[PDB]
Structures are given as C-alpha cells and as structure tokens.
C-alpha cells in the first residue's frame, strides 16, 4: 500500500465516497473516526474495529501529559501501546491547550509535529489556532494569518523528518471564522504550501448548524477537490449528513462516547436517554434495526439499570452501541452515494430521526 492515496469512487452533487489507502490500512470515506484516550473509552480495540471503524483519532494532548510522547515512543509507539494496528489520526494538541512561537501552558508547531511523530501517527495535523466565536473580522484575520504561518512551519517540520515524511500524511487546517474572504485566503495559502488532506477548522464552536452549513457552502469548494476534506469536531448525526452534502469526507466527535456514558443512545428515531423511567421494563434493544452486538444481546431495561447503577458495563454497552450506530450511519451514507440516492437518504433519515 502507498503512504497516502485518496481515490473518489462515486459522487452525488458535492458528496463523495471513496477510499484513503495508507500503509496501515484502508479508510472508507465518508469516515467517522472514534476518539480515544484507550482507542475509545470503555472499549477494547477489537470492539472498536468490530463496529466498523477504519481509523481512530489519537488524543495527543492527554498523551503528551501522561504517559508522555517520549515514553510512548520508547515503548514502541501508540499503535503497539494501545493494540490498534490500523491508521491513527493525531490531533495537534492545540484545541485542548500565546505568542508567534506557539502556546505556553511550550507547544509550538515544531514540538506538536514532533510529538505526533513520537506517537507514530499516520495522519498528522498541522498546529493551528481554533479562532473563538464570535470573532471580529480583525481578530479572525490575525488568527488565520498566524495559523497559516504555523501551517508552513508544520509542513517544514514534517518534511525534515525522513521517517515521518515517508510513512505518514500531513493535513492543513483552514481558518477564517465565518468570513468568505478569509476562508479563501486561507484555502489559497494552504494549497500553496500543499498538504495531503485539508480540514475545515474554526466551526462547531458555538455558531449553530445554520451558520455552520452556510460557511461550509462556500468554504469546502475552496479546498482542492482531489484531496480529503475533514470537518473537525463534528458531530451530531444530522450535522454529519449535512456536511457530507457539502463535500466533507471525514469527521470526529466525542459525542457518541461522551453521550453514551451519559445515558444518551442514538437510534434511527432520534436519541433516547436510557435512564428515563420509561425504559425500566422495555425489553426491546436500544434500536430496532441496529446490527451491533449490544442490540443483539441486551435490552433497554438492562442497560437502563446498569447506567442508573453507575456500572462500568453500562458505559461499555452504551459506547459500543453508539460507535456502532455512527459507523452504520457512515455505511448508509457511503452506500447511498455509491448508488446515487444520497439526497433521498438524507431526506428519509431526517424525516424519521426528527
């Protein structure tokens, strides 16, 4: 397999479906990347794979604090440490964490790229600043411009490390808040540097779905068509569907994991909160169509009891179902685009989910 190859197999409107080939595996797009600490909280890596995940997001910020990037490198890298042998996309650390050098809390672009190398990342994110929302045109500009300088520094750091350059991929991140002109400048700067993939940053930060979609409408076409498009931090099932309708290929969110241990279960009829008394004697599975192991074997009533009781097994089961649900959503999206019926799928999905 190559270091990195993105191929688009089918299209519908702005939506695309295809594959990213990398040395550690193939990634089906549009892709949902479960987020970890633990490939995913409360799941073994084999269970994460069983749900259909092709790639996971590695939480750099946590790992760089403990056990430490250098320690993980000494122990053989994050894949070996965790027991996940497929691709890992690492975050830069820069959302969870100010000067032109970087952020003191020193995390600079060079140190971020180095930490991602030490973990053994397959897809490395450039170090940026997620501009707060709302932002004035001035602040958004200043922020975006710094991020583009940091993007160039990221590129050079990555390229100056042979083993990283030969075996990993590097994504750049577009900024510019909600302003079309800044989004364009950013896209232009990133394409001049050149990356393997392009993220849309600076969204899912308080603006709401209507505004997020409006910005996606003009921002995604600015990115190179022939490279994957990653929407950072998104999101709820309806947000994913709409983003795919606007040309996004990749997603990450802590929602399924977070919400799960919370008691929220995703279903094709919308989310349910399994702690509700209404479920205490409900023998149906979390969702009537879901193919996951949890829906094959346990009832709402059981999981209701476990979550109310604060049982670890409740978190395990809720998380496995919710990650499986997201994977099934991505599979339905891929299949519908492949078959030229994604517009209809989006309409049917929303009709029932809401």
Ligand X SMILES: O=c1[nH]cnc2c(CCNCC3CCCCC3)c3[nH]c(NCc4cccs4)nc3cc12
Rounded to 5 degrees, what angle do the CA atoms 342, 122, 21 make? 45
In the residue annotation, 85 being an active-site residue is answered as no
Q: How far is CA 102 from CA 93, 97, 99, 156, 279, in A?
A: 11, 11, 5, 15, 50
Binding mask 27-56 for ligand X (x = CB under 6 A): --------x---------------------
What whole-number distance in Å separates Cα of residue 254 and Cα of residue 309?
A: 23
Under the rule (CB under 8 A), what is the footprint of a copy of itself?
37-38, 41-44, 66-67, 71, 74-76, 81-83, 280-281, 283, 297-299, 301-302, 305-306, 308-309, 311-313, 315-316
Residues 16, 28, 321, 334: which binds Zn ion (CB under 5 A)? 321
Q: How many residues bind ligand X (CB under 6 A)?
A: 16
Which has the closest alpha carbon to 171: 235, 99, 130, 223? 223
Residues 120, 197, 201, 237: which binds ligand X (CB under 6 A)? 201
Residue 202 is a binding residue for ligand X (CB under 6 A): yes
What whole-number distance in Å separates Cα of residue 219 and Cα of residue 145?
A: 16
Binding mask 80-99 for ligand X (x = CB under 6 A): -----------x---x----
Known binding residue 175? Answer is yes
Contacted entry of ligand X, Zn ion, a copy of itself, none for residue 119, CB cut-off 5 to 8 Å set by kind: none
Mention every residue, 6+ apart, whose C-beta is less than 8 A from residue 315.
41, 42, 260, 261, 307
Binding mask 277-316 for Zn ion (x = CB under 5 A): -------------x-x-xx---------------------
Contacted entry of Zn ion, a copy of itself, ligand X, none for residue 292, CB cut-off 5 to 8 Å set by kind: Zn ion
Active-site residue, from 54, 91, 249, 287? 91
What whole-number distance in Å separates Cα of residue 171 and Cα of residue 182?
A: 19
Helix (H, G, I), strand (E, B) or coil at 96: coil
- Exposed, middle or buried by CB within 10 Å (0-12, 13-18, 19+), for 172? buried
Active-site residue, from 54, 122, 239, 252? 252
CB of 197 to a copy of itself, least distance (A): 29
Contacted entry of Zn ion, a copy of itself, ligand X, none for residue 231, CB cut-off 5 to 8 Å set by kind: none
What whole-number distance in Å separates Cα of residue 333 and Cα of residue 329?
A: 6
CA atoms within 13 A on the CB side of 165: 9
Please answer whether residues 168 and 122 qualify as being in contact, where contact means their C-beta atoms are separated by less than 8 angstroms.
Answer: yes
Nearest to ligand X of 204, 216 (CB atom):
204
In the residue annotation, 196 being an active-site residue is answered as no
Please answer whether residues 34 and 257 qualify as being in contact, where contact means their C-beta atoms are separated by less than 8 angstroms.
Answer: yes
Residue ranges of the binding site: 91-95, 128, 175, 202, 290, 292, 295, 321
Q: Which residues are catalytic?
A: 91, 252
The site for ligand X (CB under 6 A) is made up of 35, 57, 59, 91, 95, 128, 130, 173, 201-202, 204-205, 232-233, 252, 254
């Amino acid at each position: 397999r190559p270091r990195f190859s993105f191929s688009i197999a089918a299209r519908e409107g702005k939506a695309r479906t295809g594959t990213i080939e990398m040395k550690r595996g193939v990634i089906r797009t549009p892709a949902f990347m479960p987020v970890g600490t633990a490939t995913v909280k409360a799941l073994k890596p084999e269970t994460v794979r069983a749900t259909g995940a092709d790639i996971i997001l590695g939480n750099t910020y946590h790992l760089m604090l403990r056990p430490g990037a250098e320690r993980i490198a000494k122990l053989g890298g994050l894949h070996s440490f965790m027991g996940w042998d497929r691709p890992i996309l690492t975050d830069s650390g820069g959302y969870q964490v100010q000067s032109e050098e970087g952020v003191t809390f020193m995390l600079s672009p060079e140190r971020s790229i180095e930490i991602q190398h030490l973990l053994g990342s397959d897809i490395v994110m450039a170090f940026d600043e997620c501009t707060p929302y709302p932002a004035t045109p001035s602040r958004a500009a200043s922020s975006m411009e710094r991020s583009m300088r940091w993007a160039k520094r990221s590129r050079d750091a990555f390229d100056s490390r042979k083993e990283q350059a030969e075996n990993a991929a590097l994504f750049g991140i577009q900024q510019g808040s909600v302003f079309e002109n800044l989004r364009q400048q950013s896209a232009d700067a990133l394409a001049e540097i050149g990356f393997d993939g392009y993220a849309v940053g600076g969204l899912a930060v308080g603006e709401g779905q209507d505004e997020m979609f409006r910005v996606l409408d003009f921002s995604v076409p600015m990115l190179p068509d022939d490279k994957p498009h990653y929407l950072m931090g998104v999101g709820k099932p309806d947000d994913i569907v709409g983003a795919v309708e606007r040309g996004i290929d990749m997603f990450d969110c802590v929602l399924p994991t977070r919400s799960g241990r919370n008691g929220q279960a995703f279903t094709w009829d919308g989310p349910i909160n399994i702690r509700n008394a209404r479920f205490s004697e409900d023998l149906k599975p979390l969702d009537s169509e879901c193919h996951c192991a949890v829906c094959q074997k346990w009832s709402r009533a059981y999981i209701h009891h476990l979550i109310r009781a604060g049982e670890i097994l409740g978190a395990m089961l809720m998380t496995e179902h919710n990650i499986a649900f997201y994977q099934q959503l991505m599979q339905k999206i891929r299949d519908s685009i492949s078959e030229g019926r994604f517009s209809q799928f989006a309409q049917d999905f929303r009709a029932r989910y809401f």
